[PDB]
Amino acid sequence: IPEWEGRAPDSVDYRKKGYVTPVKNQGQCGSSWAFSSVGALEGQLKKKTGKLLNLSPQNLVDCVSENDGCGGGYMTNAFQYVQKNRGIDSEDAYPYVGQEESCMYNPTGKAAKCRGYREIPEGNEKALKRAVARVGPVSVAIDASLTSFQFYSKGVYYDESCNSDNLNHAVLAVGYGIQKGNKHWIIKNSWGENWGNKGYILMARNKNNACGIANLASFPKM
């Protein structure tokens, strides 16, 4: 029963399974791509080794040379860096500063490795669902620019004005399900525990790829 085949469960929540580290705060730096990347790596590290450890977004901000540090970046590029670098440091060994600095990677602080990555077929929410169910938390990019998104508190978020072609923010899909009849994705943000619902938002699922949720989705292989 390969990932893209067979019975995917109705709901999944990796927070309940010890796959998800505490919600972080990226601060004034535009590094959600690095927080989304470390989130997906943290999930695979837990699955592979049984240990849950904060990995270093600053390691990615400083060292993934073609990403733009606090100016944006692609999670695919972050996974490729960890593969070619033969590791990524832990948060404790390479702590978050909130601004791009010179690369200070140290193998002594290495906490995970990467064997490559796969991308979800663009716009395909069924493939994203099967990936979350079979692999673990998946990095995704969304339009987070709307006031309705930024001041979300509860419920399943849907806004017809969300622009699936304006992928301005990277987050982590840690599960999916249904709430009062409304299908959703369970999304870990990087705006602190004070944002949304303890740092999380439920985003509409199977509603025409709302906010672009399946347009730039990927996971690392480990």
Ligand X SMILES: O=C(O)C(Cc1ccccc1-c1ccccc1)C(=O)O
Nearest Cα to Cα of residue 188 among 133, 222, 135, 144: 144
Q: Indicate the residue among 8 and 146 with the shorter CB distance to ligand X.
A: 8
Rule CB under 6 A: is residue 126 a binding residue for ligand X?
yes
- Of residues 166 and 206, the one with the C-beta less far from ligand X: 206
What is the closest distance, in whole angstroms, from the C-beta atom of residue 6 to ligand X in the complex? 7
Determine the residue with CB nearest ligand X: 8
Query: Which window, 28-36, 42-50, 65-73, 123-131, contacts ligand X (CB under 6 A)?
Result: 123-131
Render 161-214 in DSSP notation, one character per residue: T--TT---EEEEEEEEEEETTEEEEEEE-SB-TTSTBTTEEEEESSSSSGGGTT
CB 212 within 8 A of CB 167: yes
The length of the chain in residues reads 222
Shortest distance in whole angstroms from residue 80 CB to ligand X: 29
Residues 43, 134: Cα–Cα separation, whole Å: 12
**What's the closest the beta carbon of residue 205 comes to ligand X, in angstroms?**
7
By CB under 6 A, tell whether 146 contacts ligand X: no
Q: Which residues bind ligand X (CB under 6 A)?
A: 7-8, 126, 129-130, 183, 206
